[PDB]
Amino acid sequence: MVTAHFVLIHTICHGAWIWHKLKPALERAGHKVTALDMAASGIDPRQIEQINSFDEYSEPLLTFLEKLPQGEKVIIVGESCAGLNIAIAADRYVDKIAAGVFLNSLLPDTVHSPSYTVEKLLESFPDWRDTEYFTFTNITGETITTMKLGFVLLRENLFTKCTDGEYELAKMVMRKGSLFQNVLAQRPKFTEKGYGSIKKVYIWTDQDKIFLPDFQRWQIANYKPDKVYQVQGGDHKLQLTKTEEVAHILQEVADAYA
Amino acid sequence: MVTAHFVLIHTICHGAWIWHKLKPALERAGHKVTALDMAASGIDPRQIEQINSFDEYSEPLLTFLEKLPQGEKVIIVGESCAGLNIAIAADRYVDKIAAGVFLNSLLPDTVHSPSYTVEKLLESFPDWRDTEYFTFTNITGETITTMKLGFVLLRENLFTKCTDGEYELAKMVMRKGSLFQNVLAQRPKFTEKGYGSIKKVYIWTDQDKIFLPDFQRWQIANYKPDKVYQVQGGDHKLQLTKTEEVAHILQEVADAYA
Amino acid sequence: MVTAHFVLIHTICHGAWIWHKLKPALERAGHKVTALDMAASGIDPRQIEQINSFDEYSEPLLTFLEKLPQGEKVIIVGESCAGLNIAIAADRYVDKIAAGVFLNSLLPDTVHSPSYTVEKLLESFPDWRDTEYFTFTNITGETITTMKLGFVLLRENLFTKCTDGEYELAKMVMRKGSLFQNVLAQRPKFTEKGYGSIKKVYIWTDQDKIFLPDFQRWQIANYKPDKVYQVQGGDHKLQLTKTEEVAHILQEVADAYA
Amino acid sequence: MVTAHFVLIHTICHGAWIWHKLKPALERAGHKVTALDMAASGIDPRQIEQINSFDEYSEPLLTFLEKLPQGEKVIIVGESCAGLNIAIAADRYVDKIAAGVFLNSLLPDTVHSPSYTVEKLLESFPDWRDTEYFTFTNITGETITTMKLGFVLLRENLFTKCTDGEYELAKMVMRKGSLFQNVLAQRPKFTEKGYGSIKKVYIWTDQDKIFLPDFQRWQIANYKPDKVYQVQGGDHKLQLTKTEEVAHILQEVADAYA
């Protein structure tokens, strides 16, 4: 069918590694795939304590788009919190983005503060269990809250139905992350001409034990995506539990937005 | 049936992640498993350019043994170049080590320089293909050769029969490493009373496309292990291609020595 | 007379040792004094090549302020380039800083880039004589210029009127440093609400042979300090040539800002 | 009057800095002076944990002698524990040493174990007060005892009559050190043909509060030096309290043996 360039964007704490099954799957279909580490994530050499906002955290994505050859367009696929990276990138490089794909992901809008969908997430899922929290003071004095995801939360809430090998992989390479929420709160709203004007495709499952059904339904309702795909079964990490199905869906996205 | 504490030691460039399948396998049998990142490896925050020898590279292993409660013993399992870590650790903490297990690994001796088995490896396998090499000057002025493993080498020589997901994983989290060969060359020999006196179990396959058959046969011959297990099929990364079989071998090791 | 807690911050290449005379002088007057080594300076175990920006270099000062008990205030005294550390710290911990004291020091502002005063310094003093320069590539790929201060420069320009013992001391413990100037150039400006709102006291002499009179006069003009003290005679290192006089000035600072 | 090349060797924990007054003093008289940092001392980039014996600790001295032009001779001056460096160096490079000078120093012999004078020191001065002790396991599994000298011991026992500036200096740059005593104990004795044949000059004061009078008298008795100079007053650190007098004595050593 149509071939495309997917850019895969992991969530906070995680890394490009999270896409290790989906990347080859897509490449079996002849697509070009780039999986990037965001700052202080995966094997990026920076530590979270030197990162000051979610925009700074997004730097590898923005640098990648900047260097993207003119006339090429990419499809940016984002899991969980990475919808925020998609929104940010789209406000700087709208013309390089054929579509944005949201995979059990935060779905930001242009009408509320950037932090809105984060507030709502925490409203629906306030207890992160054995997760530990730390703080540091960023370069203009704002207290930033970082987290180290608890293994029980990993096992039961994120990687629920993943194999033991995958869960174990997650513990071996997980890093600290931050929502940068108090900094997001002060951030200008995402623009209609950038983020608002990209095609948006929302993939999810009702079996997600952290991005819960009412919350995801609420997101779809708050800000209508061009297409919604619901996948049966699986867990929060569909790129692991439902790899082939997600690949196929991404093909249809390519077919549509080209 | 005996239970044991296995400490899993990855090779240069790699990380604890390489054990993501074998760790849970062993845990299914009731064992305790620790997989460590060596310095500037996996997600360790240090960069290779601040590390000055193979002993310094080994620090997380040595720190772990140092803090191991008096009277506890571990079985150290090492892949590829990690036999050097095993030798180094054993010279410092012989009484904390029930056995050393060598998995398609360098098998050092006490009669030659510590660099010997490295020289012989490079003799048998001199061409590392699309691997790139870099250089830095360490804190006492020795030029250190670091490497970035080439993807073709990864695909064909290291992860030969691994799934695409594993191979792709490897590219997403591989780091630079170094043999520290010129520093190994000037290093005192491994002692009989430490490394020489631990139990040594050598597991390998003849299908290994970088640690080649004549080389591994030579290593067995140069320095006789207490027991040799040969696994049919698989590739250099048997902890991925032959996980269950390696688990079951490690149980026999535990039975014998734990 | 008012007592205070002075935190003494040395310049690049140097170390806490530089304050070996001024520290006990102040303590004779009943003050608390902390003299910190910045990263890769004095006897700090880190090497300059693992430090990536002037913010990272400032870490010990920021960690010290972070751990300072709520409601305690310090007076930060900085020589030469340490004004940058003062500016950085003040943007993060304004409420913990009673005043900032600048001793023949860079005096940054809020309207220009952080690098501005550095550019102007090099403008006025472009020839650093027998100083040697090196480079390394930092963790995000920027070339960093490091320097090893030449002994002639030490003798004639920095420690001009210091005893031969002090000069000789300097050669025995000096390390590499960096202005991190290209990284400063990209750095966000120092904020009004932090650095801009601290009390600023500028102490200097016209006998300084590296921070030259026109340059220091220009700094005072560019960014008016709350108080300016000029000390007659001495050299660049007034904490050595004019110890008692600097102590007495710092007392007036304590008396004022308390 | 004769000129000479003096090589100044500090004690454990300390560094070349300790000679910052004596070096220029001697240079006044036209001598050549080299003050070296031993391993993991002063600003040497190595940490004490990578150092495995007192021979390894001595490496900069031995490297210096090795590179000393054939036919040149030096006078090695050693304070406190540095007598051990003198003994070690002399057994390698006897023909490059005009004399050894011992300044309130350990005075080793050829009849007893290298550790003998250390045992006796600790016999006479067993309580090191607020000194902290740490431990690490060296390359062949020996536990090594390192120390961080306590400030009270510094003030009252080492730097007793030094100025406050000097004492303060010491706190700003002191590092960890080790006697390596258990390793010295296992070491081959110093040879008669090397160490035993060099000229030996012993300079001391009875006002030393750590190398006590009975102990120094005992050393002189145990192994007779060619000349003994006793300096009135001062403290353990005569290169600070009695600089000029020590310089003048070192002239006579030059006159005799250079």
UniProtKB/Swiss-Prot annotation, chains A, B, C, D:
Assembly: Homotetramer.
Amino-acid positions noted as binding acetone in the UniProt annotation, renumbered to this chain: T11, S80, C81
Catalytic reaction equation(s): a monosubstituted aliphatic (S)-hydroxynitrile = an aldehyde + hydrogen cyanide; a disubstituted aliphatic (S)-hydroxynitrile = a ketone + hydrogen cyanide; an aromatic (S)-hydroxynitrile = an aromatic aldehyde + hydrogen cyanide; 2-hydroxy-2-methylpropanenitrile = acetone + hydrogen cyanide
Keyword rRNA-binding: no
Top-level taxon: Eukaryota
Gene: HNL
Annotated protein name in UniProt: (S)-hydroxynitrile lyase
AB hydrolase-1 domain span: 5-242
Keyword annotations: Lyase
Binding annotation for 2-hydroxy-2-methylpropanenitrile: T11, S80
pH-dependence of activity, as noted: Exact pH optimum pH is difficult to determine due to the fact that acetone cyanohydrin is very unstable above pH 6.5 but HNL activity was found to rise from pH 3.5 to pH 5.4. The pH of the cell sap of damages cassava leaves was found to be 5.3.
Pfam families in alphabetical order: Abhydrolase_1 (PF00561)
Broad class of enzyme this protein falls into: lyase
Organism for this UniProt entry: Manihot esculenta (Cassava)
Biotechnological applications listed in the UniProt record: This enzyme can be used as a biocatalyst for stereoselective synthesis of a wide array of (S)-cyanohydrins by addition of HCN to aldehydes or ketones. Optically active cyanohydrins are interesting intermediates for the synthesis of alpha-hydroxy acids, alpha-hydroxy ketones, or beta-ethanolamines, all of which are important building blocks in organic synthesis.
E.C. numbers: 4.1.2.47
Function: Involved in cyanogenesis, the release of HCN from cyanogenic glycosides in injured tissues; the release of toxic HCN is believed to play a central role in the defense mechanism of plants against herbivores and microbial attack. Decomposes a variety of cyanohydrins (alpha-hydroxynitriles) into HCN and the corresponding aldehydes or ketones; two natural substrates are 2-hydroxy-2-methylpropanenitrile (acetone cyanohydrin) and 2-hydroxy-2-methylbutanenitrile (2-butanone cyanohydrin), but in vitro can also act on 2-hydroxy-2-methylpentanenitrile (2-pentanone cyanohydrin) and mandelonitrile.
Record-stated family: Belongs to the AB hydrolase superfamily. Hydroxynitrile lyase family.
GO molecular function, one term: aliphatic (S)-hydroxynitrile lyase activity
Residues the record marks as site: Increases basicity of active site His: D208
Active site, UniProt feature: S80, H236
Lineage: Eukaryota, Viridiplantae, Streptophyta, Embryophyta, Tracheophyta
